[PDB]
Design an enzyme around this catalytic site. Sequence first.
Site, PDB file in Angstrom:
ATOM      1  N   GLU A  21       0.793  -1.226   0.007  1.00 35.28           N
ATOM      2  CA  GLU A  21      -0.393  -0.371  -0.055  1.00 35.28           C
ATOM      3  C   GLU A  21       0.652   1.525   0.220  1.00 35.28           C
ATOM      4  O   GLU A  21       1.563   1.433   1.021  1.00 35.28           O
ATOM      5  CB  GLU A  21      -0.998   0.077   1.526  1.00 35.28           C
ATOM      6  CG  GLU A  21      -1.761   0.750   1.318  1.00 35.28           C
ATOM      7  CD  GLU A  21      -1.449   2.825   0.981  1.00 35.28           C
ATOM      8  OE1 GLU A  21      -0.366   2.579   1.771  1.00 35.28           O
ATOM      9  OE2 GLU A  21      -1.833   3.222   0.607  1.00 35.28           O
ATOM     10  N   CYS A  68      -5.200   4.881   6.595  1.00 36.84           N
ATOM     11  CA  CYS A  68      -4.997   3.793   5.440  1.00 36.84           C
ATOM     12  C   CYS A  68      -6.421   2.447   5.475  1.00 36.84           C
ATOM     13  O   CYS A  68      -7.149   2.060   6.099  1.00 36.84           O
ATOM     14  CB  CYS A  68      -3.906   2.714   5.755  1.00 36.84           C
ATOM     15  SG  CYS A  68      -3.295   1.131   4.744  1.00 36.84           S
ATOM     16  N   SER A 495       4.522   0.850  10.197  1.00 38.46           N
ATOM     17  CA  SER A 495       5.154   0.558   9.039  1.00 38.46           C
ATOM     18  C   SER A 495       6.265   2.299   9.281  1.00 38.46           C
ATOM     19  O   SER A 495       7.047   2.173   8.590  1.00 38.46           O
ATOM     20  CB  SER A 495       4.496   1.097   8.110  1.00 38.46           C
ATOM     21  OG  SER A 495       4.162  -0.562   7.387  1.00 38.46           O
ATOM     22  N   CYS A 539       2.994  -0.258   3.879  1.00 38.40           N
ATOM     23  CA  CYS A 539       1.462   0.915   4.339  1.00 38.40           C
ATOM     24  C   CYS A 539       2.515   2.123   4.029  1.00 38.40           C
ATOM     25  O   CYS A 539       2.630   2.332   5.726  1.00 38.40           O
ATOM     26  CB  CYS A 539       0.644   0.052   5.243  1.00 38.40           C
ATOM     27  SG  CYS A 539      -1.103   1.029   4.715  1.00 38.40           S
ATOM     28  N   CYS A 542       0.180   4.637   5.876  1.00 30.08           N
ATOM     29  CA  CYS A 542       0.003   4.311   6.854  1.00 30.08           C
ATOM     30  C   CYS A 542       1.345   5.043   7.576  1.00 30.08           C
ATOM     31  O   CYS A 542       1.372   5.792   8.815  1.00 30.08           O
ATOM     32  CB  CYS A 542       0.078   2.500   7.382  1.00 30.08           C
ATOM     33  SG  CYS A 542      -1.510   1.735   8.032  1.00 30.08           S
TER      34      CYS A 542
HETATM   35  N1  FCO Z   1      -1.239  -2.660   9.964  1.00 28.37           N
HETATM   36  C1  FCO Z   1      -1.615  -2.197   9.554  1.00 28.37           C
HETATM   37 FE1  FCO Z   1      -1.514  -0.316   8.976  1.00 28.37          FE
HETATM   38  C2  FCO Z   1       0.851   0.213   8.710  1.00 28.37           C
HETATM   39  N2  FCO Z   1       1.652   0.402   8.778  1.00 28.37           N
HETATM   40  C3  FCO Z   1      -1.698  -0.043  10.840  1.00 28.37           C
HETATM   41  O1  FCO Z   1      -1.386   0.834  12.181  1.00 28.37           O
HETATM   42 NI    NI Z   2      -2.264   0.649   6.246  1.00 24.53          NI
END
Ligand code: FCO
Ligand code: NI
Lengths: 545, 262
Positions: A21, A68, A495, A539, A542
């Site tokens: 992502e 997210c 992340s 992500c 995120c």
């Molecule tokens: N799992 C997930 Fe999204 C990320 N990195 C969050 O919190």
């Molecule tokens: Ni995420």
Amino acid sequence: KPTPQSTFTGPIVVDPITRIEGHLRIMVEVENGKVKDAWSSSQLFRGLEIILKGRDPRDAQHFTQRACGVCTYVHALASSRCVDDAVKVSIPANARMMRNLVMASQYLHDHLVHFYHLHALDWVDVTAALKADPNKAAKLAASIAPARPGNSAKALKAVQDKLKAFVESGQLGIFTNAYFLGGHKAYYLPPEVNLIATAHYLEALHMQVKAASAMAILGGKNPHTQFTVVGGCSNYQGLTKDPLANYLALSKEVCQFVNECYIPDLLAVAGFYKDWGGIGGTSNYLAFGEFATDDSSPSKHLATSQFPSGVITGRDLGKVDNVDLGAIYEDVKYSWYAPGGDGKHPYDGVTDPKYTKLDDKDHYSWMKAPRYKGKAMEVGPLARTFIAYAKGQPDFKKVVDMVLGKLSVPATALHSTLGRTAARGIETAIVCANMEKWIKEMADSGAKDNTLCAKWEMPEESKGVGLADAPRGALSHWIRIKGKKIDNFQLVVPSTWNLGPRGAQGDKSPVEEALIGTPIADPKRPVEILRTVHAFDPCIACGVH
Amino acid sequence: AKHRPSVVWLHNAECTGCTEAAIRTIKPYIDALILDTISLDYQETIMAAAGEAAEAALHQALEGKDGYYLVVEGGLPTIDGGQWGMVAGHPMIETTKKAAAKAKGIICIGTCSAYGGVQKAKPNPSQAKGVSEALGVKTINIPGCPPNPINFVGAVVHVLTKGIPDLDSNGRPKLFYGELVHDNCPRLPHFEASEFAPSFDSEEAKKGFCLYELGCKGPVTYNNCPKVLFNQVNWPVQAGHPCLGCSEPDFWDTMTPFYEQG
Ligand code: FCO
Ligand code: NI
Ligand code: SF4
Ligand code: SF4
Ligand code: F3S
Ligand SMILES: [Mg+2]
């Protein structure tokens, strides 16, 4: 054969990193076919923390959920825990139960989608599946994995026949310019295994829909749940027999698939890529824990999480330390932020964007660099797995030991990209094994009494922190309320820990460290970089928010 | 091998909830879609290629002899020449503009691409804009945060076989966005009788009373949520929470505070 590695010496940039992502650019310096230096450069800024300022704390979860849509729910949950703590309300047992079950459903959906639809393409050559004898594949499947009609010769021939027509159409679509086209030394699997993994990939596409319906029975919709409120949850219908019976039925279907397809595909893959047990390890692990029996406060969360919280430093499984929330801070020295922002505890967090230029080694990411007493921390399934294992969590001990026995490797081999991948499957299997017990507990509780939200009062001034262990790891929201409005709101996201840039001492993040020593069989098609990056399940939405 | 219409799907300033929404389609399922109905020729979330190989897939798609339809997820960050949102080293606005120029049609999936979305909320530090504003062209908007897969796949199928569906003043297909949520709500009878809940812990809430007093924006939000549901099982109000009105332009600043009518 030994691990393929070229003689390449020079830079490699991968931008975009697909099948994650968000928007990530990875830059590496390679020497003699091994990565010697690495940069993780996040490429989009949105600025949810800036947007939240001055707003109603009640509104927070609705904005932050949109950090997210892959880890949908988890930020709504963390924001809700954060505000709950700031106003000093203890949610009812039924809300703890419902909220945690929604987290369980999210792990199932999220991990399943990650292994097949994000990660598998780095390990499975889809086009090779066309060289397979379907009857031979069936026999192969029927000999190592649980009997099922989806693995029969007829089922596999039908998949191969669909794939063949698609390929022969000339429109490869999402497989266009794939790294495995024409063969690739880093791809080890026999064609019969590719066909099976591919059949499952297509099956997973339907199964993730069902995993999502189950979550929606409690969360209201998916993506982006709408059942949490300050003081608890609004979804009284979620406490009733009929919905909960369907939630159980759906979850049993999803879990059948995890045990029949995911774990077996995972172990088969790990079997062939045994060498990846020695590439991409890091040293420090952090988790806040999840699935707590007492969510009355962050302390109680940290202490009663059934997937336990803790901190491991230097791969020492003999010394799992308690999490010190006062020891978290974020650096921005190597980030695109204004000077002066280093070393900030999140309650004092500062978000002041300041871009320089592409690939400026002084400022190369939109993510902050979260640090723990000066150290980078890996978070996520692997972190949870090592902490749970270290502490003797019974389910983890049993499953991890099961996996170590099937692979014939020692537990230290789990400090690796292969460990990281295998860890994700391990916890999925554990969540699966607990669903029915968790569903029974809320069903029983709900029937006796359906209190789902508690009374509370908005304070003039206050602060609070919401902890969760999302599918990607340790997530925290941190709020300062002032004049009854949001004075500061800071997200520090799994992340961000894993994929942020260097900290103020110039120390690499977990993804950057893990990349060092990566072998590159073909610099033109560096799938080994993807294996490691994808294993961290990045992500960036995120990460940067 | 009958030719499948090329679809290019771009991700700008977004959370990816829209991509996730789309793959919750069941009529038909996403694999039957991309195997049988379209040719998804670029989609960063799921595509095999990465880096330059991925950037070359995009360009190959854009130079397609048969042409392509463009789906856009995400708003467009325009501050500092657009550098706060980049892919392959290029501002997102630049790549979207280039792709838009030759597209047979543009479908904006989600409130962010349609109208600007969450990153555009005040004080809009990235100076984000919806696609149509940033590019100066009409889009087919499928708003919602995210929108129902029924609406998007519905629109996409329509655009490939029928043409452009009838659009409301905000670019939204009237097939899906022609009625207020409120008019198809099962709690309407409560609203009409002044039977509201004053809190989520109240007995009224337990009885399923209307959520208007807790900020439900249903009466001002065009969407089909209560008629189609999500995931074949539920929708927010059915789970006892008010509508945020997440399918209305700029709802982040017109529907808040969310728990009020204030
Ligand atoms: N799992 C997930 Fe999204 C990320 N990195 C969050 O919190
Ligand atoms: Ni995420
Ligand atoms: S419209 Fe909502 S769900 Fe879709 S990308 Fe934007 S923030 Fe995410
Ligand atoms: S709950 Fe909302 S949509 Fe339903 S009747 Fe009340 S105001 Fe209308
Ligand atoms: S919040 Fe959005 S999903 Fe439907 S119920 Fe309201 S329009
Ligand atoms: Mg932050």
